[PDB]
Scaffold this active site. Sequence first.
Site, PDB file in Angstrom:
ATOM      1  N   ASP B 180       0.729  -1.362   0.063  1.00 22.59           N
ATOM      2  CA  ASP B 180       0.143  -0.059   0.067  1.00 22.59           C
ATOM      3  C   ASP B 180       0.713   1.190   0.122  1.00 22.59           C
ATOM      4  OD1 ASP B 180      -2.101   1.492  -0.086  1.00 22.59           O
ATOM      5  OD2 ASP B 180      -3.141   0.856   1.931  1.00 22.59           O
ATOM      6  N   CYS B 214      -7.906  -2.442  -4.949  1.00 21.40           N
ATOM      7  CA  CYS B 214      -6.936  -2.503  -3.764  1.00 21.40           C
ATOM      8  C   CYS B 214      -7.574  -2.248  -2.764  1.00 21.40           C
ATOM      9  CB  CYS B 214      -5.501  -1.451  -4.020  1.00 21.40           C
ATOM     10  SG  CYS B 214      -5.880   0.092  -4.442  1.00 21.40           S
ATOM     11  N   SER B 215      -6.980  -1.738  -1.545  1.00 24.24           N
ATOM     12  CA  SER B 215      -7.940  -1.666  -0.470  1.00 24.24           C
ATOM     13  C   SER B 215      -8.811  -0.458  -0.416  1.00 24.24           C
ATOM     14  CB  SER B 215      -7.009  -1.474   0.893  1.00 24.24           C
ATOM     15  OG  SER B 215      -7.693  -1.222   1.791  1.00 24.24           O
ATOM     16  N   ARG B 220      -2.862   1.908  -6.226  1.00 20.30           N
ATOM     17  CA  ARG B 220      -2.245   0.775  -6.884  1.00 20.30           C
ATOM     18  C   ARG B 220      -3.011   0.622  -8.144  1.00 20.30           C
ATOM     19  NH1 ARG B 220      -1.351  -2.680  -1.610  1.00 20.30           N
ATOM     20  NH2 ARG B 220      -3.116  -1.647  -1.049  1.00 20.30           N
ATOM     21  N   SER B 221      -4.580   0.520  -7.852  1.00 18.50           N
ATOM     22  CA  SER B 221      -5.630   0.523  -8.906  1.00 18.50           C
ATOM     23  C   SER B 221      -5.358   1.550  -9.968  1.00 18.50           C
ATOM     24  CB  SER B 221      -6.849   0.666  -8.419  1.00 18.50           C
ATOM     25  OG  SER B 221      -7.027  -0.406  -7.396  1.00 18.50           O
ATOM     26  N   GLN B 261      -1.464   7.553  -5.773  1.00 14.65           N
ATOM     27  CA  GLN B 261      -1.782   8.299  -4.499  1.00 14.65           C
ATOM     28  C   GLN B 261      -0.271   8.891  -3.965  1.00 14.65           C
ATOM     29  OE1 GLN B 261      -4.411   8.625  -1.619  1.00 14.65           O
ATOM     30  NE2 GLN B 261      -4.801   9.115  -3.772  1.00 14.65           N
TER      31      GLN B 261
END
Lengths: 6, 297
Positions: B180, B214-215, B220-221, B261
């Site tokens: 993450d 992802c979370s 990451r997406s 991010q």
Amino acid sequence: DADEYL
Amino acid sequence: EMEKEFEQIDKSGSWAAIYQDIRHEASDFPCRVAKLPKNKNRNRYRDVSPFDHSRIKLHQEDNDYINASLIKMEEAQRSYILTQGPLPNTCGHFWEMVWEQKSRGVVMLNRVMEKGSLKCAQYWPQKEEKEMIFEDTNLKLTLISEDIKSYYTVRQLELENLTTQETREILHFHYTTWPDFGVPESPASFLNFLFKVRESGSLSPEHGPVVVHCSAGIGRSGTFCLADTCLLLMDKRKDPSSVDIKKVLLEMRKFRMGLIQTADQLRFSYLAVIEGAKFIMGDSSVQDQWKELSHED
């Protein structure tokens, strides 16, 4: 908190 | 030009600055529905919400909310659905979405647990002999096979609509080593993984949009989707070098907030598009070099 990603 | 551009930014170390500019210029659209009180518990993060205009709507007439965004890239002609990691109570909704949107693949870029934090629910069966039933949405899910590699795992799932007793195969592509707020180990590992996804057909125009998460479903997406779309575009355009990565990222952020991010994720995207161009521009052998370099054994 925990309901915050940022 | 993008490799020329990449060079100035590294040479002068301006990734953080270049990244803050993208953040400053990104779109801001209302998230009204995501914010309704009745939907509090449907969101893993109260500060990562889908925009109203692009949110995916469940077809249940009770509550149609899912934290998920349709990302429709027009020029490139690919749509992705970016979503958050299902919560213990929205696993049925997640598979409802996959069924309703006719998705053929699901790309998971996180792990269920990271640095001791719960990041995502276990929303797919880990054992063939123990299938899952989502009662709220009347769906059944069964692990059929799983090819495990060093840093990722492809699974074949069978999703069945219990209402109609129809079934589909869903491919599941789980990248296990992407931290993450981190980047993949190498462009090689990432690209090798991306190309496995493409090669499965899950990205074919003839299927619903691939679901990517992802979370939170932005970092990451976002990185995964940017790189894919940029490569797609370098293929179509009579001029591959024209492709502006910063512009593509801003286009995508019209559809879901926060995509990518960190400044290092942005830097990584350049690496991956640049490297992956080699393949777009004819070097056939390069793909086998990512397989040997990614160490998938």
